[PDB]
């Protein structure tokens, strides 16, 4: 009916969506905390809906496979299994063909996460060598950027990152970050996430600048009436200062000297 609970697809990703720590078992939406849960609470209040947070069944953001089919949160929306995707879901032209997005709630670009104190200063520096491995999270927009790029350097990088003996394309962010911390490996990832990670890991740094410029939006199925309503709500949250409050809350830290 009109007041049905909305199914919200999302994915574990620090600090957007995390398991809340508790001495006792937690259940339902209370299992989760993070920037996206705060955003979802605000949207639910403004737009007057109830919601059920469900982790994406395949643990993927979404890419089109060799059969031409989508996976991840994008597929959950296409197949109407979810009403909304509230996650750091990158707005891209290819995704806009199959799902709708609100206007962006946060901006980002791809860059490089690596350790401090090395001679590696740019993507070019990584691309021209083979000792240091590098890659990206599988089945997301960063992977797709490299896979589809026609820029010489990024074509070379794609060829390398998709052809290592131990796959350099990692399952999720946490796996990639651990690889940067424990082996000679650099992770291509989004600047939002790099800022979070580098503040919590003072031996790590961003290498170079941003190599593209994009936004995150709330995803909906094509034609959903919630898309425009969520755009309006995001504008309200921005004007009120609430997006700034949420960013400060979840990117809080002591800095790195
Ligand atoms: C939310 N940012 C993180 C995550 O973003 C993804 C997913 C992306 N935000 C998407 O919507 O596909 C990326 O491809 O960079 C996967 C994962 O990669 C590490 C880091 O960039
Ligand atoms: Cl971290």
**Domain identity same for 236 and 206:** no
Q: Where does a domain end: 196, 213, 230?
A: 213
**Domain identity same for 126 and 173:** yes
**Domain identity same for 220 and 235:** yes
Ligand 1 pocket, residue 188 CB under 6 Å: no
Q: Is 182 annotated as a binding residue?
A: no
Ligand 1 pocket, residue 15 CB under 6 Å: no
**Domain identity same for 137 and 251:** no
**Domain identity same for 147 and 160:** yes
| CA-wise closest residue to 216 among 188, 191, 240, 198 | 191
**Domain identity same for 2 and 86:** yes
**Domain identity same for 133 and 205:** yes
User: Which of 72, 189, 213 should be mutated for ligand 1, with most atoms under 8 A from CB?
Assistant: 189
Please answer whether residues 218 and 85 qualify as being in contact, where contact means their C-beta atoms are separated by less than 8 angstroms.
yes
Method: X-ray
Which structure tokens are listed for 199? Answer: 């503040």
| CA 169 to ligand 2 centroid distance, Å | 18
**Domain identity same for 206 and 118:** yes
32: domain CATH number is: 3.40.190.10
Ligand nearest to the CA of 196: 2
Instruction: Give the E-state strand segments of the chain in sequence order.
Output: 6-10, 18-19, 32-33, 51-55, 84-85, 99-101, 106-108, 110-115, 133-135, 185-190, 204-207, 214-216, 219-221
Residue 63 CA: nearest ligand 1 atom is 12
DSSP character string of 1-37: -TTPPEEEEE--BTTTBEEPP-SS---GGGGEESHHH
Which structure tokens are listed for 83? Answer: 């009403």
C-alpha separations of 194 from 15, 112, 173 in Å: 11, 8, 11
**Domain identity same for 99 and 118:** no
| CA 103 to ligand 2 centroid distance, Å | 28
Strand 99-101 and strand 84-85: the pairing is unpaired
User: Which of 105, 108, 137 should be mutated for ligand 1, with most atoms under 8 A from CB?
Assistant: 137
Strand 185-190 and strand 204-207: the pairing is unpaired
Q: Is 171 helix (H, G, I), strand (E, B) or coil?
A: coil
Residue 145 CA: nearest ligand 1 atom is 14
Residue 224, C-beta contacts closer than 8 angstroms, at least 6 positions apart? 83, 100
d(CA 196, CA 189): 12
**Domain identity same for 65 and 13:** yes
**Domain identity same for 166 and 239:** no
Residue 89 CA: nearest ligand 1 atom is 11
- Per the structure, the complete domain to which residue 85 belongs is given by 1-108+214-257
Question: What is the domain count for the chain?
Answer: 2
| CA-wise closest residue to 189 among 167, 153, 214 | 214
| CA 190 to ligand 1 centroid distance, Å | 6
| CA-wise closest residue to 140 among 196, 100, 190 | 190
Please answer whether residues 41 and 115 qualify as being in contact, where contact means their C-beta atoms are separated by less than 8 angstroms.
no
CA angle 198-199-205, nearest 5°?
Answer: 25
**Domain identity same for 134 and 88:** no
Please answer whether residues 168 and 134 qualify as being in contact, where contact means their C-beta atoms are separated by less than 8 angstroms.
yes
| CA 186 to ligand 2 centroid distance, Å | 14
Ligand 1 pocket, residue 205 CB under 6 Å: no
Instruction: Give the E-state strand segments of 109-257 in sequence order.
Output: 110-115, 133-135, 185-190, 204-207, 214-216, 219-221
DSSP 111: E
């Amino acid at each position: 009916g009109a007041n049905r609970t909305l199914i919200v697809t999302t994915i574990l990703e620090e600090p957007y969506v995390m398991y809340r720590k508790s001495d006792k078992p937690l259940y339902g939406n209370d299992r989760f905390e993070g920037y996206c849960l705060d955003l979802l609470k605000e949207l639910s209040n403004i737009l007057g809906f109830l919601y059920d947070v469900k982790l994406v069944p395949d643990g993927k953001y979404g890419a089109q496979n060799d059969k031409g089919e989508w996976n991840g949160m994008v597929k959950e929306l296409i197949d109407h299994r979810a009403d909304l995707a509230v996650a750091p879901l990158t707005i891209t032209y290819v995704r806009e063909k199959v799902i709708d997005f609100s206007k962006p709630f946060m901006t980002l670009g791809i860059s490089i996460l690596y350790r401090k104190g090395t001679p590696i200063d740019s993507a070019d520096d990584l691309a021209k060598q083979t000792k240091i491995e590098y890659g990206a999270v599988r089945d997301g927009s960063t992977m797709t950027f490299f896979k589809k790029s026609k820029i010489s350097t990024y074509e070379k990088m794609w060829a390398f990152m998709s052809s290592r003996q131990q796959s350099a394309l990692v399952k999720n962010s946490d796996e990639g970050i651990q690889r940067v911390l424990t082996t000679d490996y650099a992770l291509l990832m989004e600047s939002t996430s790099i800022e979070y990670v580098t503040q919590r890991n003072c031996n790590l740094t961003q290498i170079g600048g941003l190599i593209d410029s994009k936004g995150y939006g709330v995803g909906t199925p094509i034609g959903s009436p919630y898309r425009d309503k969520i755009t309006i709500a995001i504008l309200q949250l921005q004007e009120e200062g609430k997006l700034h409050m949420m960013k400060e809350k979840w990117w809080r830290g002591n800095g790195c000297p």
